[PDB]
Structure 1
């Protein structure tokens, strides 16, 4: 047929090895949702085996590319770690070749550019991964960028990657509606308490889980912090009780 290779178009004009690679991400049952508010943007992991005695403090889905640009690569457990190094060795290659620190949009457009060259050539296979590059730029405006195994530097105000993307758009839409229409002009950079609750409420609405204390680890990249700090366990369990 026309699916055994990657560099061949189907008779209806549609690439299938790329399409099968996106199905690999929607098969590892790992869902990571991230939201972006005003000068505050967070990302939530899920901390589950990509499929006893395992140290559950090490298994994660959040890796930092630089000190101020973090991400969360989900998908195959062997392709996500390689895409972090193809980004860690890219953003570190930017600061040496350009002096100033790299932006979140330049990093995602450079990762999607490297992914595209493997699509035209039949040399390697597609990296079955999908990450949400988060971070803030020089203009103090946070961003977010999700990239699938194809080329996509789309960028969202709130996105969810994983095996639930087929219908998890309405839940993130209703939760952003409850904050935009209920905007509070008395914002004193307390969004780390407001936007983080909006994110944990999103993942708890998608997945009906009661006590997601030790299986949820988030990260905040808001201003006055600027370091992609992974929030501790005590603050996570404290945030989980504000839903009452």
Structure 2
């Protein structure tokens, strides 16, 4: 099970081991779509003197597109640079901005070439990507070390896989103006992370990033907004 080749069972165990590596980091990140917006909330901790403001999992691939990677940190930053290079190449060749879907397609093709080739290690990296398409609707595309992309209405990376799907289903069913939509989506994301982690969260140890039609640019809400939302939920 050393090379990325088939076993007698037929599975490739290197992808399973890379997924185990991603899960071992114990970093949780929840992505949620909305009516005209998308939110990613991440835990903001390592995979006394350390600068805790510098620790982040979210990234800005472009002004519009943003992402959140979880896994090995070097692999995460390398995938971030690959995503930025892919978006830049698309903009240069085509003269217009790539969307989240096509970027996820290309990144998973880049992952697949490592998957098939024995001489390439697999990146222990999962990732969510969000943005707004040309029809003014949100996107939320998730990929894993297997090189498989999928769009989600809501999704989680971390330890609580196929357990946070239940609380996400409950919250999305319960919820089912642009300002009210953005507020409700952010509240749902924060409450989902709080219920998944099952302990009260301080505003200085979580990071919430928002994309919406009102503000097309990917941006992170300040700690005062997160404190306000946490006080509102309680």
Q: TM-score range by the shorter chain?
A: over 0.9
Match of 1:55? 51
Query: Could you tell me whether the CA contact under 8 Å between 1:45 and 1:62 is conserved in 2?
Result: yes
Query: Could you tell me whether the CA contact under 8 Å between 2:36 and 2:178 is conserved in 1?
Result: no
Structure 1 residue ranges, 4+ long, deviating more than 6 angstroms after superposition = none
Give 1:211 deviation, angstroms: 3.5
Measure, in 2, the Cα distance between the counterparts of 1:103 and 1:121.
28
Measure, in 2, the Cα distance between the counterparts of 1:22 and 1:208.
24
Query: Could you tell me whether the CA contact under 8 Å between 2:29 and 2:156 is conserved in 1?
Result: yes
Give 1:153 deviation, angstroms: 1.6
Query: Could you tell me whether the CA contact under 8 Å between 2:128 and 2:140 is conserved in 1?
Result: yes
Query: How many residues of Structure 1 are paired with residues of Structure 2 in the alignment?
Result: 234
Give 1:232 deviation, angstroms: 0.4
Query: Could you tell me whether the CA contact under 8 Å between 2:34 and 2:182 is conserved in 1?
Result: no
Give 1:229 deviation, angstroms: 0.8
SS at the partner of 1:106? helix
Measure, in 2, the Cα distance between the counterparts of 1:109 and 1:236.
32
Give 1:235 deviation, angstroms: 0.7
Measure, in 1, the Cα distance between the counterparts of 2:24 and 2:114.
22
Q: How does 1:20-99 map to 2 (within 5 A)?
A: 20-50=17-47, 52-99=48-95
Give 1:187 deviation, angstroms: 2.9
Query: Could you tell me whether the CA contact under 8 Å between 1:26 and 1:164 is conserved in 2?
Result: no
More helix by share: 2
Give 1:188 deviation, angstroms: 4.3
Query: Could you tell me whether the CA contact under 8 Å between 2:32 and 2:189 is conserved in 1?
Result: yes
Give 1:217 deviation, angstroms: 1.2
Per-residue CA distance 1:97-144 (angstroms, 9 max, x = gap): 110110110000000011001111112100000110111111011010
Gaps of 5+ in 2: none
SS at the partner of 2:24? coil
Per-residue CA distance 1:136-188 (angstroms, 9 max, x = gap): 11101101011000122211000001111142110111111110xxxxxx934
SS at the partner of 1:190? helix
Query: Could you tell me whether the CA contact under 8 Å between 1:68 and 1:221 is conserved in 2?
Result: yes
- 1:235 and 2:225 are equivalent in the alignment: yes
Q: 1:167 to 1:236 in 2, by over 3 A?
A: same
Measure, in 2, the Cα distance between the counterparts of 1:21 and 1:211.
29
SS at the partner of 2:32? strand
SS at the partner of 2:202? coil
SS at the partner of 2:151? coil
Give 1:6 deviation, angstroms: 2.4
Measure, in 2, the Cα distance between the counterparts of 1:17 and 1:132.
22
Q: What TM-score, normalized by structure 2, do the two folds share?
A: 0.97
Gaps of 5+ in 1: 180-185
Q: What TM-score, normalized by structure 1, do the two folds share?
A: 0.93
Measure, in 1, the Cα distance between the counterparts of 2:65 and 2:178.
24
Measure, in 2, the Cα distance between the counterparts of 1:6 and 1:94.
32
Give 1:189 deviation, angstroms: 4.0
Query: Could you tell me whether the CA contact under 8 Å between 2:71 and 2:124 is conserved in 1?
Result: yes
